[PDB]
Design a protein around this nucleic acid. Sequence first.
RNA 1: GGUCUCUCUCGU
RNA 2: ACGAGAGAGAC
Length: 462
Amino acid sequence: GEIQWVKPNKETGRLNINGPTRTKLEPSVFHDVFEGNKEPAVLHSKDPRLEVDFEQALFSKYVGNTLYEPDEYIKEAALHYANQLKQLDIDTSQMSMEEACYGTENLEAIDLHTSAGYPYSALGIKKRDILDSTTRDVSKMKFYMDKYGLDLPYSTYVKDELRSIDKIKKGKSRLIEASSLNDSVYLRMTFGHLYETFHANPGTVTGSAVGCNPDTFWSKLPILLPGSLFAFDYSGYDASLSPVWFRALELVLREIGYSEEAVSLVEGINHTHHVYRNKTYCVLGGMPSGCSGTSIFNSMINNIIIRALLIKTFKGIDLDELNMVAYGDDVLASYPFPIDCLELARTGKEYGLTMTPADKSPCFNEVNWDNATFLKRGFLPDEQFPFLIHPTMPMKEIHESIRWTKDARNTQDHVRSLCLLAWHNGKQEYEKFVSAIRSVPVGKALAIPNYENLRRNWLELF
RNA sequence: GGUCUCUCUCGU
RNA sequence: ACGAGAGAGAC
Ligand SMILES: [Mg+2]
Ligand SMILES: [Mg+2]
Ligand SMILES: [Zn+2]
């Protein structure tokens, strides 16, 4: 992905989009009870913690483009993945505007607690002024569909969240692209059933983990991924995608039965325009993270990538013996023989991709179930039933969360949720955690789930 | 101050 | 089942 041009909003005639510059995060009552290295992300260019120009660090993720059209490796990869998807019998027909706005059994409704994007977000219009959960009225949408039309600019916001200290010094906050409600509606109408299928079928057929529940899913992964394990994360995945991968996505869609009308929407996310404050810019390549389908398209493009890198890097790769699951740029995968991720990474570099260990270790080592991670969690067989597998979020991560809050009004929910994560790390670790929480006045007011019940309710999921 | 997923809580 | 809130995860 590469920025093409930047023009002042006076010149494009786009409404400014300013977002907040102060974090919602404050230290919590547990801040000094637990150790932690994270702080809120840099939101403002005059942040005393900065050690670089802010805006330049922000947009450095657009590292440029390499390929624009598929080579023979990516064509074969695209096609193999497309065949895999066919057995799913994805309904390529258009989803109704009613189901697209207000949801289905396998697709949540448009988030009405979230911005409506450009232009509404400068016109002081909320999603709730246009949609209504109770009516399921769809006509105020169509009025606006015709008023403002489609392909409306994304609004660039910095993301308010905890980050490691290193990324704060380097001003490397995360950018998200607020989609106009129109485009979200039209994409959900175009790919809602695909969304439904993917959500209902996490695993190695979709090649996706979207819609998985780590508590039950994790016991299946060793069965879905037999053989030698390998794993990846990427650095700046979204912005590092060159247009070739959106082309490859197109072929996949067309192969599984999408009309040329449908397929044509992909170029609309490969070539995007963004408003950031008082400027307009053009990004060619890159996933506009914040468009509808982000997680899923990220994951599909990821399936094409892995396949393409395998058959271009190694001799006599049989793609039918690949098993992989992806969540965005997260990858857990298996193959009948050990895969040298260092060489895959080298080949990924040629295409503009920066591939790293899945734990952001400094080098690629052997991956196995004892050291594998997926969605930050690691894999721990239960000491009584070894075929049941605990998803283990590292306590360190759980400590980072509990030290901050955006509203102390939800301390009890915050702490309980963490508890539901922490207990997988086992009895001794859990009581260590609970103990610390109780060592402070507010902690003694908190309803903390009992370890025994947690484990009992987990077992019964099976 | 986005797309989404999972889970929990509180109501009817 | 429907609403409201939250936490976590991927970009
Ligand atoms: Mg990454
Ligand atoms: Mg990742
Ligand atoms: Zn452009």
